[PDB]
Ligand binder design. Structure first.
Ligand SMILES: *[C@@H]1O[C@H](CO)[C@@H](O[C@@H]2O[C@H](CO)[C@@H](O)[C@H](O)[C@H]2NC(C)=O)[C@H](O)[C@H]1NC(C)=O
Ligand SMILES: *[C@@H]1O[C@H](CO)[C@@H](O[C@@H]2O[C@H](CO)[C@@H](O)[C@H](O)[C@H]2NC(C)=O)[C@H](O)[C@H]1NC(C)=O
Ligand SMILES: *[C@@H]1O[C@H](CO)[C@@H](O[C@@H]2O[C@H](CO)[C@@H](O)[C@H](O)[C@H]2NC(C)=O)[C@H](O)[C@H]1NC(C)=O
Ligand SMILES: *[C@@H]1O[C@H](CO)[C@@H](O[C@@H]2O[C@H](CO)[C@@H](O)[C@H](O)[C@H]2NC(C)=O)[C@H](O)[C@H]1NC(C)=O
Ligand SMILES: *[C@@H]1O[C@H](CO)[C@@H](O[C@@H]2O[C@H](CO)[C@@H](O)[C@H](O)[C@H]2NC(C)=O)[C@H](O)[C@H]1NC(C)=O
Ligand SMILES: *[C@@H]1O[C@H](CO)[C@@H](O)[C@H](O)[C@H]1NC(C)=O
Lengths: 597, 146
């Protein structure tokens, strides 16, 4: 009864119950996901309902213990995570209104239908075909149509709903001593009073705007190259001092330039590394690939699979007609019962996805000792970060020719290396300007700096200034372009895909500087080492029990994200791009327009 | 003396002289001068029934830790706060018994293990029962050491 006893003795009970219930819920869910029937939806909805009701009751009960009389750090962190009101601080009818606006937004996004002006009877959804038209077509007219349509029919309906959504979320967040909603998102990177490891909510914006400054020397050259290359497929449509038209990037919103590899390959007659026929000519099943992944993981010094994962998991899609959503996922039903749900085919891409998923499996195996409320990554970003380095280290030619899938006399050269590096940088450094731009735009519109009659003009001037792309058609203020992105119209945070891109290469360099590697970083492997495994595992097992700025400094040695490893990873590509642009004009002028000529 | 019960997987490390934890603290306490013999094995296929088998309980609230070889079976509602409970669950008045919910799809360290312990003690008796002897055919007509 030391004013904290109720804190520790409450916490226990909670712990137990929580864990148990959660498990019930989760088994239920895995079920429905692997065997789609009509009754299983009911078997899982009530389990989720009971879990949610129990958690909200415990949250309403935890309030009775003040948060300044606690002295131990871990119990204070657990209470601070549980004591969160979340929603339901609003007026009751406004809560239902918020649920309706959210669900209506999600539905209007999901079931969008756009139809041709030449044939309005049968037409296209978003997922089947629209992405294919925007990715694989090659005529300017069809791309411009597919681009303007989706923003003229799904951008116009969403604005009068997003307007109310903003103010409702702001009034929600403003009851928990917060000043807007964006701060309620940045609050994930917050650390209070640990004598030096503190990280104020504000300094996240400072880091982001301070690390985006060092990327531009590389992104500018990449933009110049991609532009001078796109000036071949569509002759006399781009200006050599202008920006790019949004409907030429490779998808609906311009998030990944990966589909531009067909037009901008450096050496179009030297094929890259690809183990796809060598696999099937060796009769590899879904079992063999996972055995290879586990062998690689155990080679570095991590434990085996739990021997309950080989009988329960579903590695190959069920033969008969058994509807199960084929989207890879790593389940941690808790209680040490880990599973992997994915419809593996015999392709090297699935061979890399297996590694990327067993990464999450290992990361979940590590921290299974912490209290139940601390079973996550250090923040939202570390999870996929620690996941992706396995795929980045398993795709190098060394690890391939050491497993029996490449001819021993396969000799790699600098041409194939530049090819691979551009294929990588079309995805890694390509999405960063878009990500930072969209997140800054959302923070701005939430804090109230941008008046609600200047949304689209500000968004497009930002697309002109930062990322270097220009709209093809004018858009007045009956539109809303950002509401046409999945992570926006569904109330999903969108800054993790910018911190992950940095944490990735920081982890890569920090780790395989212990494997005593000597060459460029893009050939670096973490196999056969034991110091690397220990350095990684001394962070994998913390969970949330320590501030993330300590989880970093125990791996790389710094107390923040630093972009230098990224540039050090791309240095060869940068040396090449500095030569292939001796005659073009780097950068872009925000005056050019595709219609004002 | 022969004791037997069932406990979780990763808690068998607590049936040993001089340990601590939610199980060994106050469910079963072995002394510091133990002379017995601990046996413990896995019984997943015999005691775990899908959907939850809520028969086995384990106390996790008590005033103070136990005494060696002592036994406590009460069901008095705990009291952590300062206000007396009057036997009603709720705020700072917790039920003292929970249940292991075993299922066959658990990992090692959570499947039910069965534990038995032997303990000897020689009060004053000089003959309560000796161990097992050897075997062989007694030869005859030979000078032998018998
Ligand atoms: C997928 O779920 C369905 C819906 O229950 C299962 O179908 C029945 O499941 C019960 C459960 O024991 C069986 O007794 C019936 O014989 C099943 N009937 C049919 C027509 O399937 C189905 O078995 C589940 N699939 C798997 C692989 O377990
Ligand atoms: C209160 O904080 C202390 C340390 O500040 C925690 O002590 C650790 O407890 C764990 C198990 O709970 C042990 O494995 C560690 O060895 C302990 N650390 C040290 C330095 O002895 C203590 O657990 C915290 N209280 C609670 C209820 O978690
Ligand atoms: C969470 O919401 C509650 C309202 O439901 C806020 O108000 C506190 O509510 C608790 C119990 O419901 C009271 O004991 C407090 O006196 C209330 N006021 C406070 C704590 O200032 C509560 O403030 C909200 N949580 C936070 C962290 O602000
Ligand atoms: C890949 O490596 C080869 C050999 O190391 C390079 O070939 C030489 O490149 C320099 C660079 O200007 C030229 O001056 C030489 O004339 C090249 N050698 C021959 C025999 O012609 C090649 O350039 C490298 N690839 C790239 C893209 O630079
Ligand atoms: C690095 O790891 C690989 C993976 O096991 C080890 O590969 C073995 O290498 C020896 C000799 O090079 C071969 O005889 C074995 O057949 C290989 N094993 C497999 C499964 O292919 C390699 O030994 C490790 N490196 C070192 C220095 O031990
Ligand atoms: C992992 O499993 C293999 C089975 O092939 C076994 O030989 C090895 O000893 C195991 N290692 C550990 C650490 O459990």
């Amino acid at each position: 009864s030391t004013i904290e006893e109720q804190a520790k003795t409450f916490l226990d009970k909670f712990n137990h119950e929580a864990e148990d219930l959660f498990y019930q819920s989760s088994l239920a869910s895995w079920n429905y996901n692997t065997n789609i029937t009509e009754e299983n939806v009911q078997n899982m909805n009530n389990a989720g309902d009971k879990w949610s009701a129990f958690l909200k009751e415990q949250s309403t009960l935890a309030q009775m213990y003040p948060l300044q009389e606690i002295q131990n750090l871990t119990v204070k962190l657990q209470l601070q995570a549980l004591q969160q009101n979340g929603s339901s601080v609003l007026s009751e009818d406004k809560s239902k209104r918020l649920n309706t606006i959210l669900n209506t937004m999600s539905t209007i996004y999901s079931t969008g239908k756009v139809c041709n002006p030449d044939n309005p009877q049968e037409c296209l959804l978003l997922e089947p075909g629209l992405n294919e038209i925007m990715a694989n077509s090659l005529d300017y007219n069809e791309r411009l149509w597919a681009w303007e349509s989706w923003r003229s029919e799904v951008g116009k309906q969403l604005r009068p709903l997003y307007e109310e959504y903003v103010v409702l979320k702001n009034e929600m967040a403003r009851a928990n001593h917060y000043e807007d909603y964006g701060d309620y998102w940045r609050g994930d990177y917050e650390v209070n009073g640990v004598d030096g490891y503190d990280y104020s909510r504000g300094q996240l914006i400072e880091d982001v705007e301070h690390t985006f400054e060092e990327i531009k020397p590389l992104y500018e050259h990449l933009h110049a190259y991609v532009r001078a290359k796109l000036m071949n497929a569509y002759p006399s449509y781009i200006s050599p001092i202008g920006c790019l038209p949004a409907h030429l990037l490779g998808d609906m919103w311009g998030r990944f330039w990966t589909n531009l590899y067909s037009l901008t390959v450096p050496f179009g007659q030297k094929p890259n590394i690809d183990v796809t026929d060598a696999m099937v000519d060796q009769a590899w099943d879904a079992q063999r690939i996972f055995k290879e992944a586990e062998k690689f993981f155990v080679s570095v010094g991590l434990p085996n699979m739990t021997q309950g994962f080989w009988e329960n998991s579903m590695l190959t899609d069920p033969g008969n007609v058994q509807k199960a959503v084929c989207h890879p996922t790593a389940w941690d039903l808790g209680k040490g019962d880990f599973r992997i749900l994915m419809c593996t085919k015999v392709t090297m891409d699935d061979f890399l996805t297996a590694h990327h998923e067993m990464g999450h499996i290992q990361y979940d195996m590590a921290y299974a000792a912490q209290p139940f409320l601390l079973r996550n990554g250090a923040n939202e970003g570390f999870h996929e970060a620690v996941g992706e380095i396995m795929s980045l280290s398993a795709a190098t030619p060394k690890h391939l020719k050491s497993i029996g899938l490449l001819s021993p006399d396969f000799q790699e050269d600098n041409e194939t290396e530049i090819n691979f590096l551009l294929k990588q940088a079309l995805t890694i450094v390509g999405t960063l300007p878009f990500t930072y731009m969209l997140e800054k735009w959302r923070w701005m519109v939430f804090k109230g700096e941008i008046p609600k009659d200047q949304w689209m003009k500000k968004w497009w001037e930002m697309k002109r200034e930062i990322v270097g792309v220009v709209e093809p058609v004018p858009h007045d203020e009956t539109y809303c372009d950002p509401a046409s992105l999945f992570h926006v119209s569904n109330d999903y945070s969108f800054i993790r895909y910018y911190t992950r891109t940095l944490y990735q290469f920081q982890f890569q360099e920090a780790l395989c500087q212990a494997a005593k590697h000597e060459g460029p970083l893009h050939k670096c492997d973490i196999s056969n080492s034991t110091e690397a495994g220990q350095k990684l595992f001394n962070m994998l097992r913390l969970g949330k029990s320590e501030p993330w700025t300590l989880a970093l400094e125990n791996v790389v040695g710094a107390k923040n994200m630093n972009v230098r490893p990224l540039l050090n990873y791309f240095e060869p590509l940068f040396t090449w791009l500095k030569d292939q642009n001796k005659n073009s004009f780097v950068g872009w002028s925000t005056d050019w327009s595709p219609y004002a000529d | 003396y022969a004791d037997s019960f069932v406990i979780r997987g990763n808690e068998v490390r607590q049936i040993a002289p001089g340990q601590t934890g939610n199980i060994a603290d106050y469910n079963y306490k072995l002394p510091d001068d133990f002379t017995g013999c601990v046996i413990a094995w896995n019984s997943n296929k015999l005691d775990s029934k899908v959907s939850g088998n809520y028969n086995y309980l384990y106390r996790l609230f008590r005033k103070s830790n136990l005494k060696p070889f002592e036994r406590d079976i009460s069901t008095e509602i705990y009291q952590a706060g300062n206000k007396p409970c009057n036997g009603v669950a709720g705020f700072n008045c917790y039920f003292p018994l929970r249940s292991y919910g075993f299922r066959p799809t658990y990992g090692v360290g959570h499947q039910p293990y069965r534990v038995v312990v032997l303990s000897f003690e020689l009060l004053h008796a000089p003959a309560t029962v000796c161990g097992p002897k050897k075997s062989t055919n007694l030869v005859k007509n030979k000078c032998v050491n018998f």
